Amino acid sequence: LPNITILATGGTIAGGGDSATKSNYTVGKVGVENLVNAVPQLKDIANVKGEQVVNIGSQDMNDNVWLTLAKKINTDCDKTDGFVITHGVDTMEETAYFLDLTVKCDKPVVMVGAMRPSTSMSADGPFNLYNAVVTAADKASANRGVLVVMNDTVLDGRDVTTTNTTDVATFKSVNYGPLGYIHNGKIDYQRTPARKHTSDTPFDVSKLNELPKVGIVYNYANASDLPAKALVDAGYDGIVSAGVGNGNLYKSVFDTLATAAKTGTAVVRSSRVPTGATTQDAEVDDAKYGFVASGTLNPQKARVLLQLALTQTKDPQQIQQIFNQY
Amino acid sequence: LPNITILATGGTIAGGGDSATKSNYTVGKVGVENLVNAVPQLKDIANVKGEQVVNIGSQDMNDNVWLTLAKKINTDCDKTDGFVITHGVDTMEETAYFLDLTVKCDKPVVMVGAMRPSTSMSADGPFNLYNAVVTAADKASANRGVLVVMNDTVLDGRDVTTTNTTDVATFKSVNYGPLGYIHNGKIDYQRTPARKHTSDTPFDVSKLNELPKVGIVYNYANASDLPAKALVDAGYDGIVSAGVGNGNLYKSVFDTLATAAKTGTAVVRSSRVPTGATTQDAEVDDAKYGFVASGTLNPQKARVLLQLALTQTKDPQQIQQIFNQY
Amino acid sequence: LPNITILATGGTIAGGGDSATKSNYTVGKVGVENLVNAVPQLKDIANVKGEQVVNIGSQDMNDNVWLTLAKKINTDCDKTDGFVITHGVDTMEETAYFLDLTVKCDKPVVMVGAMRPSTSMSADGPFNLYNAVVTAADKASANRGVLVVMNDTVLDGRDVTTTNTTDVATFKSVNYGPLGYIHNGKIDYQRTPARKHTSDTPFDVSKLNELPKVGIVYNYANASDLPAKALVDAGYDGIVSAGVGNGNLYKSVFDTLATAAKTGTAVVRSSRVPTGATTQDAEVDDAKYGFVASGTLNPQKARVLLQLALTQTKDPQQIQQIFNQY
Amino acid sequence: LPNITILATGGTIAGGGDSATKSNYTVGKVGVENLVNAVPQLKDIANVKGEQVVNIGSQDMNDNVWLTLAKKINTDCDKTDGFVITHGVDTMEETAYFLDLTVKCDKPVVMVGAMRPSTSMSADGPFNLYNAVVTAADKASANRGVLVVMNDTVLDGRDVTTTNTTDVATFKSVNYGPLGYIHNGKIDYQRTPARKHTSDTPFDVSKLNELPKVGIVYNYANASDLPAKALVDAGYDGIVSAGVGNGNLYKSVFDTLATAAKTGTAVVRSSRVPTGATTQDAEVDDAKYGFVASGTLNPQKARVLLQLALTQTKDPQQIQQIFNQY
């Protein structure tokens, strides 16, 4: 049986409330050992070893946890046959993509969470964790990049997103679909991400102490330019626009971002719209402003790629190419 | 045949490019009478009269245009049998819900646009317009609140949202579903929104020249508090959070908003997740902080209602009751 | 606290296997009182009484069980405040719509099941049951027709259908959407079905020991007419076609059904396509052939209504009017 | 510019009605030349050559058109750079999969249709045909198997299905998602089907005059065994069950099919449920009855694979392996 390492970071999977029945809960007070022991059947599928890396709600996820995780997986790759990472729902799609772009271990790296706390009736965490271990133990899971496993489904860390605030079935790859479905501890893989990941990216965080500063600004009717100005005034290295429609910007926000780009701020147009690509050759002449189009990357995922692009270049043309390859 | 009035605002529905094939287009050099003449079959179902209210990309939609529209529809209600409003796709969901809450005419008010340019191969606007007029001429459309008609579907103004950046089928009511489908010029209506709309709301905009200042801030891993601080420093009447998962807030953003809410800024927790309610009784003690949970209202929709709630009250308990009724 | 009656029929919700991990299970060796005792929090919200009506896999659901249930609910209406019916997932959508059309009690009648066995890791049945009882105890659930409660969602009996073979989130109202979502033991109802149900239908099953014989035939490339002929040769009261696209029929099948419809068999065109209406005024001249178009009723739902329409009339014009009202 | 062959078979794309506005139409009276000339911009992207193979509604698609198409593509492969096939919506998913399994040309083979007739307002056919030619001309489209292009999306012929009776956006790969999206005449491919197709299958129809007889029977509550018996009595080589839930059978239908399998009839369990796999190791002991589980193949697609399997073997174990590889 394979050796699988659980790197725990907190999340609702490690959350608890005083009633099985009421919706209230807190995260940060349930250790990895407790999660493992709630899933006795993991003995049938792997030699599990748990480590508590941090214990936080993923609403508080940050750069330094990202760097710690990537360096730890790259470092320990040779000590184990696979990794499972327990994590909150809220920012799972961001951490999964960061790791997709920075892990050099091509052994399976699987993230898992739960929508219901560990204390609740019909808690989803136990079976999700089981299925994440299944996935991490499956030799066929290697070289697919970093994965999220939730609700009996294996998802690639680039396209995966949380689609509903409360539903146990929330995680979906909303543009290109899942990689495989898990039934009875077996996976029929029918897909693999073509975008370059892991050891095929140039991004190397092994010596990085920090990541370039990238912020996100939202567009809507009568949108204030104040948030965009505040990132510019603080000297942000990059800004991602959560645009309206096909990545469009309220006029105010456009002006501030156009001026920013001319001073060397990287500006990436994404979209608040939950599916579909932010394309070139629509209403914004990106070449003219030095903007980059995000493709199918949503604002939070565009931030991830932008920060990593900014560790290699500040040239908008080269940042567009990165957005076309990763 | 019914008298139907078309109020044009702009949008892709009367936007054009150099060729039928390519995606590039600018919006707002096509006139209202022009759009009509293109769909001569409109004469089979209504006597249409067209007025150009403004001619903009809806990415530059703003409070003034909203107020202009609400007042026009309300003043002209007794002069026609129904209204169609042509509008850009980008912020159609915002304008529809604003009008849903402020329009006092209970004659049908139908919004319509297009995802493909006038000039494009297989342009969707002609048939969209036709179906929008079908809907506005149907007696069964009255008293259902402000409607959006796209892709053969009749969608209520509160739940309707754009789900894809380029797809002709983008507009969906993603939480509660459509009201009716249109086929062969008839509608089988099987649903109506329970939330109070139009003449069942206390919002009265007839004598307002401006709306309260409400801004939106985005949450994500390592989120800066600088956007939120910029809004508080400007003395914004309200701030909506596009939270992560079930409306949660990055720690720094939470600190800044906790302060805003006890300092004269109403704070509404919404979510960047495209479906489902931001709920009470989850991880955030709304009462302690003076926060309001948005329910199914997405951030830009939550802004609409918060602006209007602030015309009536600054008390977060009363604002929450508004978010529970409209 | 309200008196709620649970009528058990079987299903996966009280089905079990040898282990929590593996997918294998048989259905119907768990008792009704057993299921209750497993969810002790039921006592916080109702006084529940349980009766075992039958104990079957719902794949063997039949006309007798339907009639038994309708009559029981109708006779016992005045003796409880609401009903929960535990049932297999496989034909839950059929039974719910039959009861939707025949139940005369306008107290809440809620159906519930489970996609995972009793014995499985992260079993969905306990919380499903809890939420089903929440829904049946809610006064706001009355007069909305027969309901199905699954995965925190309240779904009307006409539109609800199972969309996936294994997913806990399978049950969706795929054309008109849900009625309400349940969170923290409360329901925010925002929709109600317009189609006539329960006491607004003329279908009265109190004195029937059998239902008219209605069969379903499938269409596909090179479809044999032999199934359709077998039903006509047996003198079936009706045949539903699971047509291709918008209810179309393979040529041979069309010939056999054209004949059936002028020869004492009612013929309803439905569709194998999982969403959308089978319409009039498309490629098939329904009036010429004596055919009925099913609208959004899928084949198995169309059977339900056709059986009940045939208790009242054999005239295809009257049957079509039924399909337009219920 | 590449040479692209259009093989036309009829369909709604070649359909017409007397009004742009009314839903009525017929197919079989609009030739390929007419479709080509409706899309002048095809000159910018390919040297197009059209041939009318047949001119029928796809509700009448059959084995002999399938064999004619596959043999024609295999024969003419060296005379052209790609193929587009114009076809009705109704059975497109069946023809696409057949060709996916029998074409040995690894040059792009793309199917295309339209939901609205060529005569209607906002007819979808012209732009769909444009995008199908784009796809067929893209070198990157080779070795992805046979494709369907509809509504700006490239779909693999195995998973692709029509999901709505009337919506222009109906075609979706409902289990594993699309391969790429088309914008401005360019395709970003992010996926390829892992299931073996085209020159990687053993199926060779070059010398076949006919295909084994396979029928489909539907399951529902109180299902008659008469259709299953009628296929058995006629000596059908195979039967596919459109099962309930995870491919379950009403007891009557089970008995007839169990007995059939013991006499050498091939029996494949599929599901009427529109997404998800019909799995082994659920409620049916397939090994015991000599049944085969269809996986994610829906009944009509299981028929296609079954007919082709039956040209190689009648052994159920070997037919299961075929269902696990193709």
DSSP secondary structure letters along D212-251:
--EEEEE--TT--SHHHHHHHHTT-SEEEEEEBTTTB--H
User: Å resolution of this model?
Assistant: 2.0
Class of domain B213-326: alpha beta
Picking from A95, A157, A93, A251, the residue whose alpha carbon sits closest to that of residue B272 is: A93
Picking from C16, C93, C88, C80, the residue whose alpha carbon sits closest to that of residue C51 is: C80
Structure tokens at D133: 């030619």
- Closest-CA residue in chain A for C153? A167
SS3 content of chain C, % helix, strand, coil (to 5): 35, 25, 40
D147 in Cβ contact with D44 (< 8 Å): no
Instruction: Count how many Cα atoms sit within 13 Å of the Cα of residue A289 in the half-sphere of its side chain.
Output: 22
Picking from C252, C265, C264, C253, the residue whose alpha carbon sits closest to that of residue C217 is: C253
Q: How many CB atoms lie within 10 A of CB B205?
A: 21
Catalytic machinery residues of B: 12
Catalytic choice (C12, C91, C95, C153): C12
C36 in Cβ contact with C42 (< 8 Å): yes
CA distance A57 to A25: 11
Kindly list the residues from chain B whose CB atom is less than 8 angstroms away from the CB atom of residue C280. 184
Structure tokens at B96: 């529809």
Residue D168 is given by DSSP the state: T
B197 in Cβ contact with B157 (< 8 Å): yes
Is the CB of residue C50 less than 8 Å away from at least one CB of chain D? no
- Of C168, C183, C185, which has the smallest distance from its Cβ to A151's Cβ? C168
Is the CB of residue B123 less than 8 Å away from at least one CB of chain D? yes
CA distance B265 to B233: 11
Catalytic machinery residues of A: 12
- Neighbors of chain B with 3 or more C-beta pairs under 8 Å: A, C, D
Within chain C, all domains assigned CATH 3.40.50.1170 are found at: 1-212
Report strand pairing: B147-150 vs C47-56: unpaired
CA distance D169 to D151: 6
B190 and C194 in contact by Cβ < 8 A?
yes
Closest-CA distance, D45 to chain C, in angstroms, reads 31
Q: How many CB atoms lie within 10 A of CB D209?
A: 8
Picking from C223, C296, C282, the residue whose alpha carbon sits closest to that of residue C257 is: C223
A232 in Cβ contact with A256 (< 8 Å): yes
Kindly list the residues from chain C whose CB atom is less than 8 angstroms away from the CB atom of residue D285. none
Q: Select the residue from C244, C249, C301 to test the D interface by mutation, using most D Cβ atoms within 10 A.
A: C244
Closest-CA distance, C133 to chain A, in angstroms, reads 13
Q: Select the residue from D120, D121, D130, D155 to test the B interface by mutation, using most B Cβ atoms within 10 A.
A: D121
Q: Select the residue from C18, C21, C23 to test the A interface by mutation, using most A Cβ atoms within 10 A.
A: C21
Q: Answer positive or negative: Cα dihedral of A224, B316, B297, A97.
A: positive
- Closest-CA residue in chain A for D282? A184
B241 in Cβ contact with B253 (< 8 Å): yes
- Closest-CA residue in chain D for C277? D165
Residues 6+ apart with CB under 8 A from C78: none
Closest-CA distance, B44 to chain A, in angstroms, reads 33
Question: What distances in angstroms separate CA C191 from CA B191, C134, C162, one per listed residue?
Answer: 6, 18, 20
Is the CB of residue C186 less than 8 Å away from at least one CB of chain B? no
Is the CB of residue D101 less than 8 Å away from at least one CB of chain C? no
A176 and D190 in contact by Cβ < 8 A?
yes
- Closest-CA residue in chain A for C170? A169
Is the CB of residue B184 less than 8 Å away from at least one CB of chain D? yes
CA distance D250 to A144: 40
- Neighbors of chain D with 3 or more C-beta pairs under 8 Å: A, B, C
- Closest-CA residue in chain D for A278? D183
Cβ-Cβ pairs closer than 8 A, B with C, add up to: 56
Picking from C133, C155, C123, the residue whose alpha carbon sits closest to that of residue C85 is: C133
CA distance B36 to B317: 47
CA distance D314 to D326: 17
Q: Select the residue from B174, B218, B254 to test the A interface by mutation, using most A Cβ atoms within 10 A.
A: B218
CA distance A78 to A81: 8
What technique determined this structure? X-ray
Picking from B260, B313, B312, the residue whose alpha carbon sits closest to that of residue B291 is: B260
Q: How many CB atoms lie within 10 A of CB B135?
A: 28
Rg (CA), chain B: 20
Closest-CA distance, C301 to chain D, in angstroms, reads 9
Is the CB of residue B178 less than 8 Å away from at least one CB of chain C? yes
Is the CB of residue A103 less than 8 Å away from at least one CB of chain C? no
Q: Is D166 exposed, middle or buried (0-12, 13-18, 19+ CB in 10 A)?
A: buried
Enumerate the β-bridge partners of residue B56: B10
Torsion region of B116: left, alpha or beta (phi above 0 gives left; psi -120 to 50 gives alpha): beta
Structure tokens at A165: 């605030």
CA distance A244 to C279: 36
Is the CB of residue D25 less than 8 Å away from at least one CB of chain A? no
Is the CB of residue B287 less than 8 Å away from at least one CB of chain A? no
Closest-CA distance, A199 to chain B, in angstroms, reads 24
Is the CB of residue D177 less than 8 Å away from at least one CB of chain A? yes
CA distance A119 to A34: 12
D292 in Cβ contact with D267 (< 8 Å): yes
Q: At what angle do helices D226-233 and D251-262 cross, to 10 degrees?
A: 20
- The domain B1-212 belongs to what CATH superfamily? L-asparaginase, N-terminal domain (3.40.50.1170)
Kindly list the residues from chain A whose CB atom is less than 8 angstroms away from the CB atom of residue C127. 120-122
Report strand pairing: D15-16 vs D26-27: antiparallel
Look at residue A128 and give its three-state secondary structure.
helix
- Of D176, D276, D277, which has the smallest distance from its Cβ to A191's Cβ? D176
B240 in Cβ contact with B270 (< 8 Å): yes
Degrees (nearest 5) of the Cα angle D101, D104, D106? 105
CA distance C106 to C141: 9
CA distance B47 to B4: 6
B262 in Cβ contact with B290 (< 8 Å): yes
- Of A20, A39, A184, which has the smallest distance from its Cβ to C41's Cβ? A20
- Closest-CA residue in chain B for D125? B122
Picking from A239, A222, A224, the residue whose alpha carbon sits closest to that of residue A299 is: A239
Kindly list the residues from chain C whose CB atom is less than 8 angstroms away from the CB atom of residue B100. none
D178 and A177 in contact by Cβ < 8 A?
yes
Degrees (nearest 5) of the Cα angle D14, D16, D20? 125
Kindly list the residues from chain B whose CB atom is less than 8 angstroms away from the CB atom of residue A230. 224, 226-227, 229-230
B168 and D183 in contact by Cβ < 8 A?
no
Tell me the one-letter amino acid at C39. Answer: V
Residue C162 is given by DSSP the state: E
Picking from C324, C250, C302, the residue whose alpha carbon sits closest to that of residue C97 is: C302
CA distance B5 to B66: 17
D5 in Cβ contact with D82 (< 8 Å): yes
Within chain B, all domains assigned CATH 3.40.50.40 are found at: 213-326
